[PDB]
């Protein structure tokens, strides 16, 4: 399939990644930069993020889903369903509204595309209605992350896809904070894209720190694999 071979071709080796994010949550403005690489053949990503404006006003775990589905590993028999890579190199826009249960919500807009040989993810984030002593602004989330499934379905009306899933953030008291994610992806180019049948992506994530880094940061490792179609 010429289309599959196209995107595939762009992600055959290790691809350098650049991440830039500008956010504002409850009047607190901040910026974050991230770098790393992705290897779609194995569905692996490795990134290091640094808050360049000082201390991050929100917990790092809350930004994991915001900070690259195009690096997912799609089994051979599911390659014709890989919307993410078919939209490259022009890219796609990834929009979300993340609802934190009993708390505020994030509104994000990201552009994911190639700039030379580098995959860039430019993000704008707006957080509103957060409680001053809730789990987010109160920094009560643990520095860890659970495994989750992301459900994908076509949105032929917009020549793109709709995505939905719930994240469970562990709270320091043993309880959990739910984050409902509503997502929409549309291509940037006018070119054709692959619209998939219903399926999902399994995500495994591990968070760490760089013992040598004095700046507020986060090291993220992700494993992503497509599934749901026999």
mmCIF file of C-alpha atoms in Angstrom:
data_model
loop_
_atom_site.group_PDB
_atom_site.id
_atom_site.type_symbol
_atom_site.label_atom_id
_atom_site.label_comp_id
_atom_site.label_asym_id
_atom_site.label_seq_id
_atom_site.Cartn_x
_atom_site.Cartn_y
_atom_site.Cartn_z
ATOM 1 C CA UNK A 1 0.000 0.000 0.000
ATOM 2 C CA UNK A 2 1.728 3.208 -1.303
ATOM 3 C CA UNK A 3 0.015 5.307 1.367
ATOM 4 C CA UNK A 4 1.186 3.065 4.222
ATOM 5 C CA UNK A 5 4.708 2.958 2.781
ATOM 6 C CA UNK A 6 4.693 6.774 2.742
ATOM 7 C CA UNK A 7 4.189 7.503 6.429
ATOM 8 C CA UNK A 8 5.966 4.298 7.314
ATOM 9 C CA UNK A 9 8.988 5.554 5.385
ATOM 10 C CA UNK A 10 9.109 8.763 7.449
ATOM 11 C CA UNK A 11 9.161 6.804 10.723
ATOM 12 C CA UNK A 12 11.533 3.933 9.815
ATOM 13 C CA UNK A 13 14.372 5.010 12.072
ATOM 14 C CA UNK A 14 14.826 6.963 15.263
ATOM 15 C CA UNK A 15 13.270 10.413 14.916
ATOM 16 C CA UNK A 16 14.384 13.424 17.000
ATOM 17 C CA UNK A 17 11.539 15.222 18.756
ATOM 18 C CA UNK A 18 11.121 18.797 19.865
ATOM 19 C CA UNK A 19 8.330 19.848 22.226
ATOM 20 C CA UNK A 20 7.271 23.418 23.091
ATOM 21 C CA UNK A 21 4.404 24.367 25.376
ATOM 22 C CA UNK A 22 2.937 27.675 26.545
ATOM 23 C CA UNK A 23 0.390 27.429 29.300
ATOM 24 C CA UNK A 24 -1.665 29.468 31.683
ATOM 25 C CA UNK A 25 -3.512 27.929 34.611
ATOM 26 C CA UNK A 26 -5.432 30.118 37.067
ATOM 27 C CA UNK A 27 -3.369 33.165 36.186
ATOM 28 C CA UNK A 28 -0.024 31.342 36.342
ATOM 29 C CA UNK A 29 1.853 31.527 33.048
ATOM 30 C CA UNK A 30 4.625 29.062 32.257
ATOM 31 C CA UNK A 31 6.602 27.504 29.412
ATOM 32 C CA UNK A 32 8.104 24.069 28.895
ATOM 33 C CA UNK A 33 10.581 22.705 26.342
ATOM 34 C CA UNK A 34 11.217 19.046 25.679
ATOM 35 C CA UNK A 35 13.530 16.950 23.552
ATOM 36 C CA UNK A 36 13.952 13.276 22.864
ATOM 37 C CA UNK A 37 13.438 10.695 20.171
ATOM 38 C CA UNK A 38 10.852 8.232 18.997
ATOM 39 C CA UNK A 39 11.078 4.839 17.358
ATOM 40 C CA UNK A 40 7.743 3.841 15.843
ATOM 41 C CA UNK A 41 9.062 0.414 14.874
ATOM 42 C CA UNK A 42 8.948 -0.454 18.600
ATOM 43 C CA UNK A 43 6.359 2.120 19.703
ATOM 44 C CA UNK A 44 8.904 3.735 21.999
ATOM 45 C CA UNK A 45 9.412 7.376 22.998
ATOM 46 C CA UNK A 46 11.881 8.977 25.381
ATOM 47 C CA UNK A 47 11.666 12.624 26.353
ATOM 48 C CA UNK A 48 12.984 15.113 28.864
ATOM 49 C CA UNK A 49 10.910 18.203 29.690
ATOM 50 C CA UNK A 50 12.126 21.380 31.350
ATOM 51 C CA UNK A 51 10.095 24.248 32.747
ATOM 52 C CA UNK A 52 11.910 27.334 31.531
ATOM 53 C CA UNK A 53 9.944 29.936 33.503
ATOM 54 C CA UNK A 54 10.803 28.506 36.905
ATOM 55 C CA UNK A 55 8.661 26.137 38.943
ATOM 56 C CA UNK A 56 5.804 24.292 37.247
ATOM 57 C CA UNK A 57 2.513 25.581 38.733
ATOM 58 C CA UNK A 58 0.821 22.202 38.208
ATOM 59 C CA UNK A 59 1.924 18.590 38.831
ATOM 60 C CA UNK A 60 4.014 17.085 36.019
ATOM 61 C CA UNK A 61 1.766 13.995 35.794
ATOM 62 C CA UNK A 62 -1.150 16.186 34.641
ATOM 63 C CA UNK A 63 0.772 17.113 31.497
ATOM 64 C CA UNK A 64 1.808 13.627 30.404
ATOM 65 C CA UNK A 65 -1.029 13.103 27.917
ATOM 66 C CA UNK A 66 -0.504 16.621 26.503
ATOM 67 C CA UNK A 67 3.261 16.256 25.985
ATOM 68 C CA UNK A 68 2.768 11.914 19.993
ATOM 69 C CA UNK A 69 0.447 9.186 18.740
ATOM 70 C CA UNK A 70 2.300 9.091 15.425
ATOM 71 C CA UNK A 71 5.001 7.029 17.187
ATOM 72 C CA UNK A 72 2.596 4.219 18.028
ATOM 73 C CA UNK A 73 3.500 0.768 16.743
ATOM 74 C CA UNK A 74 0.799 -0.461 14.408
ATOM 75 C CA UNK A 75 0.772 -4.230 13.751
ATOM 76 C CA UNK A 76 1.234 -4.988 10.045
ATOM 77 C CA UNK A 77 -2.406 -6.003 9.597
ATOM 78 C CA UNK A 78 -3.564 -2.684 11.068
ATOM 79 C CA UNK A 79 -1.288 -0.310 9.124
ATOM 80 C CA UNK A 80 -4.087 0.910 6.870
ATOM 81 C CA UNK A 81 -5.663 2.325 10.051
ATOM 82 C CA UNK A 82 -2.717 4.551 11.051
ATOM 83 C CA UNK A 83 -4.225 8.027 10.664
ATOM 84 C CA UNK A 84 -1.380 9.707 12.539
ATOM 85 C CA UNK A 85 1.425 8.773 10.165
ATOM 86 C CA UNK A 86 -0.668 9.223 6.991
ATOM 87 C CA UNK A 87 -1.104 12.918 7.819
ATOM 88 C CA UNK A 88 2.695 13.436 7.774
ATOM 89 C CA UNK A 89 4.793 15.350 6.959
ATOM 90 C CA UNK A 90 2.276 18.222 6.754
ATOM 91 C CA UNK A 91 0.968 17.155 10.137
ATOM 92 C CA UNK A 92 -2.238 17.365 12.092
ATOM 93 C CA UNK A 93 -3.863 19.456 14.777
ATOM 94 C CA UNK A 94 -4.605 17.757 18.070
ATOM 95 C CA UNK A 95 -7.274 19.385 20.197
ATOM 96 C CA UNK A 96 -8.427 18.373 23.641
ATOM 97 C CA UNK A 97 -10.536 19.320 26.581
ATOM 98 C CA UNK A 98 -9.434 17.477 29.712
ATOM 99 C CA UNK A 99 -11.930 17.424 32.550
ATOM 100 C CA UNK A 100 -10.573 16.858 36.036
ATOM 101 C CA UNK A 101 -13.458 15.460 38.100
ATOM 102 C CA UNK A 102 -14.599 17.862 40.851
ATOM 103 C CA UNK A 103 -12.033 20.349 39.620
ATOM 104 C CA UNK A 104 -10.912 22.436 36.656
ATOM 105 C CA UNK A 105 -10.248 21.560 33.060
ATOM 106 C CA UNK A 106 -7.501 21.992 30.489
ATOM 107 C CA UNK A 107 -8.083 23.167 26.946
ATOM 108 C CA UNK A 108 -5.204 22.327 24.653
ATOM 109 C CA UNK A 109 -4.336 22.872 21.037
ATOM 110 C CA UNK A 110 -1.314 21.296 19.432
ATOM 111 C CA UNK A 111 0.258 21.196 16.009
ATOM 112 C CA UNK A 112 2.314 18.109 15.222
ATOM 113 C CA UNK A 113 4.457 18.229 12.100
ATOM 114 C CA UNK A 114 7.905 17.859 10.610
ATOM 115 C CA UNK A 115 10.366 20.747 10.483
ATOM 116 C CA UNK A 116 13.275 19.354 8.544
ATOM 117 C CA UNK A 117 14.023 15.911 10.028
ATOM 118 C CA UNK A 118 12.688 16.935 13.456
ATOM 119 C CA UNK A 119 9.180 16.063 14.648
ATOM 120 C CA UNK A 120 7.775 19.146 16.404
ATOM 121 C CA UNK A 121 4.884 19.354 18.863
ATOM 122 C CA UNK A 122 3.886 22.982 19.547
ATOM 123 C CA UNK A 123 1.257 23.255 22.259
ATOM 124 C CA UNK A 124 -0.914 25.946 23.814
ATOM 125 C CA UNK A 125 -2.649 25.139 27.087
ATOM 126 C CA UNK A 126 -5.348 26.974 29.027
ATOM 127 C CA UNK A 127 -6.426 25.781 32.469
ATOM 128 C CA UNK A 128 -9.575 27.193 34.060
ATOM 129 C CA UNK A 129 -11.753 26.743 37.145
ATOM 130 C CA UNK A 130 -9.180 24.915 39.267
ATOM 131 C CA UNK A 131 -9.692 24.814 43.043
ATOM 132 C CA UNK A 132 -6.966 26.439 45.139
ATOM 133 C CA UNK A 133 -6.811 23.408 47.415
ATOM 134 C CA UNK A 134 -7.905 20.741 44.944
ATOM 135 C CA UNK A 135 -5.563 17.888 44.009
ATOM 136 C CA UNK A 136 -4.007 19.785 41.110
ATOM 137 C CA UNK A 137 -3.164 23.263 42.444
ATOM 138 C CA UNK A 138 -2.567 21.597 45.807
ATOM 139 C CA UNK A 139 0.088 19.302 44.325
ATOM 140 C CA UNK A 140 -1.359 16.121 45.828
ATOM 141 C CA UNK A 141 -0.663 13.773 42.907
ATOM 142 C CA UNK A 142 1.988 11.090 43.181
ATOM 143 C CA UNK A 143 4.881 11.091 40.721
ATOM 144 C CA UNK A 144 3.839 7.973 38.836
ATOM 145 C CA UNK A 145 1.542 6.837 36.047
ATOM 146 C CA UNK A 146 -0.812 3.944 35.242
ATOM 147 C CA UNK A 147 -1.441 2.024 32.026
ATOM 148 C CA UNK A 148 -4.420 3.075 29.914
ATOM 149 C CA UNK A 149 -6.219 2.384 26.648
ATOM 150 C CA UNK A 150 -7.068 5.134 24.160
ATOM 151 C CA UNK A 151 -10.128 4.532 21.995
ATOM 152 C CA UNK A 152 -10.048 5.794 18.464
ATOM 153 C CA UNK A 153 -12.811 6.198 15.928
ATOM 154 C CA UNK A 154 -13.187 7.955 12.609
ATOM 155 C CA UNK A 155 -14.969 11.273 12.266
ATOM 156 C CA UNK A 156 -15.571 11.249 8.506
ATOM 157 C CA UNK A 157 -17.492 14.497 8.852
ATOM 158 C CA UNK A 158 -14.223 16.266 9.657
ATOM 159 C CA UNK A 159 -11.949 13.961 7.678
ATOM 160 C CA UNK A 160 -10.252 13.259 10.998
ATOM 161 C CA UNK A 161 -10.610 11.285 14.177
ATOM 162 C CA UNK A 162 -12.224 11.519 17.570
ATOM 163 C CA UNK A 163 -10.540 10.146 20.628
ATOM 164 C CA UNK A 164 -11.822 9.531 24.109
ATOM 165 C CA UNK A 165 -10.444 8.008 27.316
ATOM 166 C CA UNK A 166 -10.163 8.419 31.076
ATOM 167 C CA UNK A 167 -6.932 8.800 33.042
ATOM 168 C CA UNK A 168 -6.603 7.802 36.690
ATOM 169 C CA UNK A 169 -4.040 9.838 38.641
ATOM 170 C CA UNK A 170 -2.957 8.372 41.984
ATOM 171 C CA UNK A 171 -3.366 10.751 44.896
ATOM 172 C CA UNK A 172 -1.015 10.674 47.891
ATOM 173 C CA UNK A 173 -3.789 9.437 50.217
ATOM 174 C CA UNK A 174 -4.343 6.277 48.179
ATOM 175 C CA UNK A 175 -7.344 7.696 46.336
ATOM 176 C CA UNK A 176 -7.493 8.601 42.637
ATOM 177 C CA UNK A 177 -8.206 11.735 40.593
ATOM 178 C CA UNK A 178 -10.075 11.156 37.330
ATOM 179 C CA UNK A 179 -9.298 13.089 34.139
ATOM 180 C CA UNK A 180 -11.790 12.668 31.258
ATOM 181 C CA UNK A 181 -10.163 13.300 27.877
ATOM 182 C CA UNK A 182 -12.068 14.393 24.791
ATOM 183 C CA UNK A 183 -9.865 14.656 21.732
ATOM 184 C CA UNK A 184 -10.088 15.600 18.098
ATOM 185 C CA UNK A 185 -7.434 15.333 15.357
ATOM 186 C CA UNK A 186 -7.639 16.883 11.903
ATOM 187 C CA UNK A 187 -5.044 17.045 9.132
ATOM 188 C CA UNK A 188 -3.193 20.237 8.333
ATOM 189 C CA UNK A 189 -2.620 19.467 4.675
ATOM 190 C CA UNK A 190 -5.217 19.139 1.964
ATOM 191 C CA UNK A 191 -3.863 15.701 1.120
ATOM 192 C CA UNK A 192 -5.674 12.379 1.689
ATOM 193 C CA UNK A 193 -5.475 10.581 5.052
ATOM 194 C CA UNK A 194 -6.324 7.114 6.274
ATOM 195 C CA UNK A 195 -9.601 7.008 8.215
ATOM 196 C CA UNK A 196 -9.524 4.062 10.629
ATOM 197 C CA UNK A 197 -12.005 1.516 11.845
ATOM 198 C CA UNK A 198 -12.616 1.532 15.578
ATOM 199 C CA UNK A 199 -9.553 0.509 17.541
ATOM 200 C CA UNK A 200 -7.399 1.495 20.473
ATOM 201 C CA UNK A 201 -3.860 2.189 21.615
ATOM 202 C CA UNK A 202 -2.336 0.748 24.805
ATOM 203 C CA UNK A 203 -0.036 3.092 26.661
ATOM 204 C CA UNK A 204 2.566 2.266 29.275
ATOM 205 C CA UNK A 205 4.353 5.243 30.823
ATOM 206 C CA UNK A 206 7.173 5.625 33.328
ATOM 207 C CA UNK A 207 8.214 8.913 34.953
ATOM 208 C CA UNK A 208 11.674 9.653 36.300
ATOM 209 C CA UNK A 209 14.068 12.434 37.215
ATOM 210 C CA UNK A 210 17.550 13.424 36.073
ATOM 211 C CA UNK A 211 19.707 13.389 39.233
ATOM 212 C CA UNK A 212 21.967 16.027 37.615
ATOM 213 C CA UNK A 213 19.219 18.503 36.656
ATOM 214 C CA UNK A 214 18.587 21.456 38.997
ATOM 215 C CA UNK A 215 15.738 22.858 36.928
ATOM 216 C CA UNK A 216 12.149 21.665 37.490
ATOM 217 C CA UNK A 217 11.761 18.829 34.978
ATOM 218 C CA UNK A 218 10.416 15.387 34.123
ATOM 219 C CA UNK A 219 11.789 12.422 32.230
ATOM 220 C CA UNK A 220 9.169 10.446 30.344
ATOM 221 C CA UNK A 221 9.283 7.026 28.727
ATOM 222 C CA UNK A 222 6.283 5.726 26.779
ATOM 223 C CA UNK A 223 5.417 2.497 25.010
ATOM 224 C CA UNK A 224 2.479 2.650 22.616
ATOM 225 C CA UNK A 225 0.964 -0.208 20.641
ATOM 226 C CA UNK A 226 -2.140 -0.285 18.456
ATOM 227 C CA UNK A 227 -4.680 -3.090 18.939
ATOM 228 C CA UNK A 228 -8.328 -4.091 18.883
ATOM 229 C CA UNK A 229 -8.459 -5.658 15.421
ATOM 230 C CA UNK A 230 -7.833 -9.402 15.065
#
